[PDB]
Amino acid sequence: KTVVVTTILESPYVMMKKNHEMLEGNERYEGYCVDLAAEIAKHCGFKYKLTIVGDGKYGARDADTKIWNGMVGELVYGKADIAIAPLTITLVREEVIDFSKPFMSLGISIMIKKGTPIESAEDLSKQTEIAYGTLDSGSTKEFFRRSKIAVFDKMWTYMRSAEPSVFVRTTAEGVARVRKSKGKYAYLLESTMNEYIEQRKPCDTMKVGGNLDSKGYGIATPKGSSLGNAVNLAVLKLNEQGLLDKLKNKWWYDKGECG
């Protein structure tokens, strides 16, 4: 049986190729997670189909219906066999799905438009002229909803009440908002994507400050699925052989246009 692999369009993990229109199936896509899947699949010995998660989300639970969306939902409700994406290992998710050991480390970070007088979360939290938000339906937004350390609680309180909404549907949307808001909008997102964007034309954004936390991405499977075991072992072997570090260099820095 072919493995249904759910993933999301997010750079530089999974992207459509320049010439995608003439390509078919898995060949249409390229990127870090695209290579990883091939590798995972090779060492685990399976054929698989890359499909793009329908609602374009990572996954969260509707507090009312208790229904999961995003890639989490596709796994939980049986639509997909495995998620290969920049999906953050968290407690509420681990309660309903399986994660492999982290294939990549990262932290919540701040993106600014160059020249923006912000150096920290502290800075953001003690001012009002510059708006800031996060990705909706992701681990980052949950972070602030659950974090009552002084600075963060203050920020969440501002964000959860802010108007018009500081929250965004995708990273691209968040990133475009920073770029067009003449420095009046900052964007909270994971260091991996932040660092990546900093190295792309128009080269007008930067990561300022350090990460707010430490965590990781895991390959996810439905609870107690037969693939979880081998997948997990594969990730370890891949990390140990330098392949992961190799892919990260290939997709981040070898592919960087801000010299």
Add this chain to the structure above:
Amino acid sequence: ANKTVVVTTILESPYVMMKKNHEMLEGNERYEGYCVDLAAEIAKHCGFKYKLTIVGDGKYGARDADTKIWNGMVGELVYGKADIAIAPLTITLVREEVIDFSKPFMSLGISIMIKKGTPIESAEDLSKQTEIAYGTLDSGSTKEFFRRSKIAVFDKMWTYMRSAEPSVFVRTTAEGVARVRKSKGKYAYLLESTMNEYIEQRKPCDTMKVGGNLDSKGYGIATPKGSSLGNAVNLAVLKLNEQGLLDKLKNKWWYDKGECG
């Protein structure tokens, strides 16, 4: 069914250390450190009584190539002497094949410790020369990293290290540090960034971590394969990390206690 959980661990600063007055204290109270703090938390959130015990042979764990027997903290779990290990125990493939690991509670990488002023900036630097000697911990993941590496700079360093005389390998982290301090810059030490960074904050303040990490990995809390504890422990680590506890603990034992301004 009320069983005190036997916790195997290792004496490694600042993870687990003897209290100055341990001679007058009993049980768990004899000890202090990051992993001592962690152990108390994990047991509280998993609802169990536990006894801290120092690993008998003082090692992390490797499989003897001849006898095929596992030593160190890993062996303790494999052969049933202990119920759980809570230490700076690196998650690796060969270990994961024989025991269970939680999701990582701390991140790290192989790094270079030098005596200050030692003309070394990188691994490539070590490999390109011979005046300065360098070694790793025995029976650890770092050594195995090099013995297995297929990348040029690392195979070079390995083939040098494995044949070098006298041996550039040490029995304990402390032995490696002292050797750096006493070797006038003629010896450099390969170890994980977490320990490197700790030691750089201690008197006499004569060492430093140079370069970037060679790799990226994690410490995990280990249980015997199939043990019932694994699930809760794993869930506990994820919550403690999200509630910020792990971040606090690293502050407490590394930086709030720095002797080097």
